[PDB]
Amino acid sequence: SHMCDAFVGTWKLVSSENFDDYMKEVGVGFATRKVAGMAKPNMIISVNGDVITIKSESTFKNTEISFILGQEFDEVTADDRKVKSTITLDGGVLVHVQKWDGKSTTIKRKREDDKLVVECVMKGVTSTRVYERA
Numbered sequence: 001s002h003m004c005d006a007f008v009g010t011w012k013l014v015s016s017e018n019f020d021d022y023m024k025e026v027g028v029g030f031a032t033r034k035v036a037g038m039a040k041p042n043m044i045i046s047v048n049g050d051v052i053t054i055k056s057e058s059t060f061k062n063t064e065i066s067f068i069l070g071q072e073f074d075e076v077t078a079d080d081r082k083v084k085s086t087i088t089l090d091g092g093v094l095v096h097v098q099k100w101d102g103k104s105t106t107i108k109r110k111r112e113d114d115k116l117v118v119e120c121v122m123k124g125v126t127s128t129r130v131y132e133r134a
């Protein structure tokens with residue numbers, strides 16, 4: 001067992017707050033905001049040795065990232081940004097920083113009760129997206 005065990009599984013989006021304004025701040029255009037904001041993704045998290053894999057599946061896009069904690073990687077996001085990402089575990093929270101074009105956004109995934117609470121922050125705008133086990 002590892003602390004990260006609490007994240008493993010299939011998680012379904014159950015609520016979202018302020019995601020449209022967060023996407024505006026990230027620079028996402030109108031049409032992608034509307035279609036992406038409509039999505040109800042599942043977030044599938046698994047661990048094999050030191051490698052964590054996080055899949056996002058939805059009607060909009062399916063994405064997958066695999067990574068080792070603290071080791072930067074290149075990622076293409078669902079909205080087609082080309083970003084440099086680093087994910088760490090900080091006090092029980094998975095902290096995902098994405099850098100591109102001199103910008104940065106931070107995505108925090110935390111277990112709270114039976115939920116996975118995900119806070120996304122860009123330029124002082126936060127969106128909170130909550131997932132429950134499938």
Ligand SMILES: c1ccc(-c2c3c(nc([C@@H]4CCCO4)c2-c2nnn[nH]2)CCCCC3)cc1
Nearest residue numbers: 023028036039041056058060061078079118129
């Ligand atoms: C379908 C719809 C939305 C996304 C998405 C997107 C973004 N940020 C998230 C953040 C990350 C973690 C929780 O939300 C998700 C997401 N990934 N999984 N669920 N949502 C960046 C803003 C532009 C839109 C793409 C992915 C697929």
